[PDB]
Amino acid sequence: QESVKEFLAKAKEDFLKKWETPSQNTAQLDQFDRIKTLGTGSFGRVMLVKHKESGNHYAMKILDKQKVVKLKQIEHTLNEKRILQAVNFPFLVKLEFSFKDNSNLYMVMEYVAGGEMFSHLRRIGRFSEPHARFYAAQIVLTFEYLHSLDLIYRDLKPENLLIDQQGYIQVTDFGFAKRVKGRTWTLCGTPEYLAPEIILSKGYNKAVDWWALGVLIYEMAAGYPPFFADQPIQIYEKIVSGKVRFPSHFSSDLKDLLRNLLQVDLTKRFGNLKNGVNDIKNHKWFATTDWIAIYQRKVEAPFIPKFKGPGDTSNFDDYEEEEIRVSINEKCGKEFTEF
Ligand SMILES: O=C(N[C@@H]1CNCCC[C@H]1OC(=O)c1cc(O)c(C(=O)c2c(O)cccc2C(=O)O)c(O)c1)c1ccc(O)cc1
C-alpha cells in the first residue's frame, strides 16, 4: 500500500504530461493495405490493416469528419484520441498512430485477434465463477487506474472487451468516456448497464462504473444481464427498482458482492464507500486473486482463443465493406485543429 500509491503517483504524471501536450499526427493513410472490416459505428468503422513495410497488422479506426460534426460529437471524438494516447495500462488498447485527412480522422491501434467477449460469452453460454473472476479481476484494476486520473469510463459492456491473445481482456472505446471532477450529467450509455443515478438524471460520478461492473460480472456469470427487458422503458423500471434475482448456481460470496455493486444507493454502493476500491478488492470472492500477478499477466488464463496466424480474423463477425473515400479538398479542417 506503500506500494499502490507511488505507482499511481507516477502513473498520474505520465498521464498529464501526455495530456497537456499530445502528438498531432504520426502517419499517413497510405502506408497501410486495408484488409477487412472489424466493426462499425455511427460514424466510422474499425479495420484490419497491414503495415506496408512492417507487416504488423493493426486495427484502424476511421471516422467521417462530416458525419461527426454533423452532430456535435466533435468533443467526444477529440477526447477519445486525447485520452487514448495519454493513458498507459496493460488492459488498455495501445494507440499506435493518429492522423487525419481532408475527410477522415484516423486511429490505428493494436489488433487483438481474440475478438470481443460478447461472442465468447454468447458462444460458451456462461462463464465459470473463476473465468468471470479472472476478467473482473482485470476490469477492477483498470478502473482503479482510470478513476485515479479523474476519468469516468461510462461505457462498460462485453462488446467493449477484446480478448487478447493471452486470455487477457483489453478495453476499447473511450468514445463515451469523460474526464471530470465531481458529478456529470450526460445520459451516455446502454440501458441494460446504466446506474440508476443516470436514469433518474441527477448527477452521477465514477460510481456508475462499479455498478456496471456488477451487471457485468453478473452477466458474465448468468449468461444474461441483471435487468433485462424488451423495451428500454421497462428496464428503467427495474434497474431503478433494484429487483435483482440471482440464479441458484451463484456462490454466496458472489451473490454478496453484487448485493453491493448493484447498490441502488451510492452512499452504500461499493467502490464508492469510504475504503473505496479496497472493499471490492478485499471482499471474499477475490480471495484467490493475486492482484499483482494479474496486473503483470502471470496468471494462466481460463481461456485462450484460437488464432490461426498473422492476420487471423475468425473471431470477428462479417461486415459489408465499402472503400475509404478521401476527398480532394479538405473538409471541416478547422473544427479538428487539435486532433
Ligand atoms: O473496438 C473495436 N471494435 C469496436 C468494438 N466495440 C464495440 C462495438 C464494435 C466496434 O465498433 C467500432 O468499430 C466503432 C465504430 C465507430 O464508428 C465508432 C464511432 O464512430 C464513435 C466514436 O469513434 C466516438 C464516439 C461515438 C461513436 C459512435 O459510433 O457512436 C466507435 O466508437 C467504434 C476494436 C478495437 C481494437 C481492435 O484491435 C479491434 C477491434
Side-chain angles (χ1 to χ4, degrees):
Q1 211 193 14
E2 183 173 19
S3 288
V4 71
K5 47 221 227 158
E6 296 190 24
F7 172 71
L8 290 196
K10 314 196 182 212
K12 187 144 195 205
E13 303 186 83
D14 276 25
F15 182 61
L16 307 132
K17 204 171 296 122
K18 316 266 203 183
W19 177 266
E20 280 171 287
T21 48
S23 144
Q24 292 321 313
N25 284 1
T26 198
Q28 310 172 227
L29 197 311
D30 274 286
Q31 338 143 258
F32 302 116
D33 272 278
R34 307 181 256 318
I35 302 188
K36 184 184 154 45
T37 274
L38 310 188
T40 67
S42 22
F43 36 113
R45 68 194 33 227
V46 188
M47 298 198 350
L48 177 59
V49 321
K50 185 204 154 118
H51 191 68
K52 267 176 156 82
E53 205 147 292
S54 305
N56 304 348
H57 292 53
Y58 286 83
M60 166 200 300
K61 212 210 199 141
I62 325 176
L63 308 106
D64 182 291
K65 297 185 179 173
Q66 285 171 267
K67 202 162 219 267
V68 179
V69 163
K70 196 75 160 130
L71 261 190
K72 189 237 120 136
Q73 276 235 129
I74 164 139
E75 308 295 16
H76 271 314
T77 282
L78 302 140
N79 263 300
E80 183 156 5
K81 155 191 123 97
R82 191 148 164 109
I83 291 175
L84 216 43
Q85 54 92 26
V87 304
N88 171 304
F89 207 47
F91 310 111
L92 283 186
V93 217
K94 289 149 79 138
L95 204 176
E96 283 305 337
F97 322 100
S98 75
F99 66 63
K100 44 179 165 168
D101 63 11
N102 317 93
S103 258
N104 305 306
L105 293 313
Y106 309 63
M107 318 199 240
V108 147
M109 36 214 157
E110 259 185 340
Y111 177 61
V112 11
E116 297 157 29
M117 165 198 112
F118 183 97
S119 290
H120 297 327
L121 172 64
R122 315 263 180 224
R123 166 154 101 305
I124 156 72
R126 86 297 101 121
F127 287 162
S128 69
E129 307 187 13
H131 201 162
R133 199 171 318 115
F134 186 64
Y135 293 143
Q138 18 200 205
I139 289 341
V140 145
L141 271 164
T142 337
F143 281 47
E144 174 184 283
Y145 168 116
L146 282 204
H147 307 31
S148 162
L149 290 28
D150 307 276
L151 276 164
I152 141 200
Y153 183 95
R154 306 199 293 175
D155 190 47
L156 196 68
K157 49 163 163 210
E159 316 86 289
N160 305 49
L161 293 102
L162 318 169
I163 293 169
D164 90 48
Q165 293 100 253
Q166 313 191 166
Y168 290 71
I169 91 209
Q170 200 103 327
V171 186
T172 187
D173 221 291
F174 288 86
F176 296 19
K178 178 170 215 182
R179 148 157 240 229
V180 320
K181 196 45 176 252
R183 331 156 76 209
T184 339
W185 287 244
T186 315
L187 205 177
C188 282
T190 290
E192 333 194 286
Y193 288 63
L194 300 165
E197 296 83 293
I198 301 159
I199 296 128
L200 299 183
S201 28
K202 318 158 97 200
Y204 57 81
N205 72 50
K206 34 176 120 218
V208 145
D209 273 346
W210 304 111
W211 169 284
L213 173 45
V215 8
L216 193 64
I217 302 221
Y218 178 104
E219 161 157 34
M220 265 204 303
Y224 48 108
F227 318 80
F228 169 102
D230 185 274
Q231 275 320 112
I233 173 79
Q234 273 97 11
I235 305 181
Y236 303 150
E237 212 159 307
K238 8 175 105 52
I239 298 220
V240 105
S241 88
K243 202 275 187 249
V244 205
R245 182 220 128 234
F246 319 81
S248 348
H249 67 288
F250 276 26
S251 71
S252 285
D253 294 29
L254 179 44
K255 297 142 116 309
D256 203 55
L257 189 27
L258 322 160
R259 269 184 202 110
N260 296 95
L261 292 170
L262 281 29
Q263 164 76 253
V264 185
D265 216 306
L266 49 81
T267 29
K268 271 52 115 87
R269 172 159 3 121
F270 275 41
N272 191 199
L273 316 191
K274 202 165 308 235
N275 198 197
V277 107
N278 301 310
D279 299 350
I280 287 150
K281 301 187 86 161
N282 301 306
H283 183 283
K284 289 180 112 161
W285 205 87
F286 283 103
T288 23
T289 346
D290 185 10
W291 309 102
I292 304 309
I294 274 192
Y295 158 72
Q296 315 166 98
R297 352 176 132 248
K298 291 148 102 200
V299 186
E300 199 262 323
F303 165 35
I304 298 214
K306 198 41 168 65
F307 313 113
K308 311 198 211 157
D312 195 11
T313 310
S314 6
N315 314 291
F316 288 94
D317 165 20
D318 281 329
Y319 305 90
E320 204 183 272
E321 14 229 338
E322 311 140 311
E323 68 182 291
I324 296 78
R325 84 166 56 177
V326 194
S327 176
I328 35 185
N329 64 173
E330 180 188 279
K331 301 314 221 50
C332 299
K334 208 33 220 180
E335 284 92 342
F336 299 82
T337 318
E338 294 194 282
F339 193 113

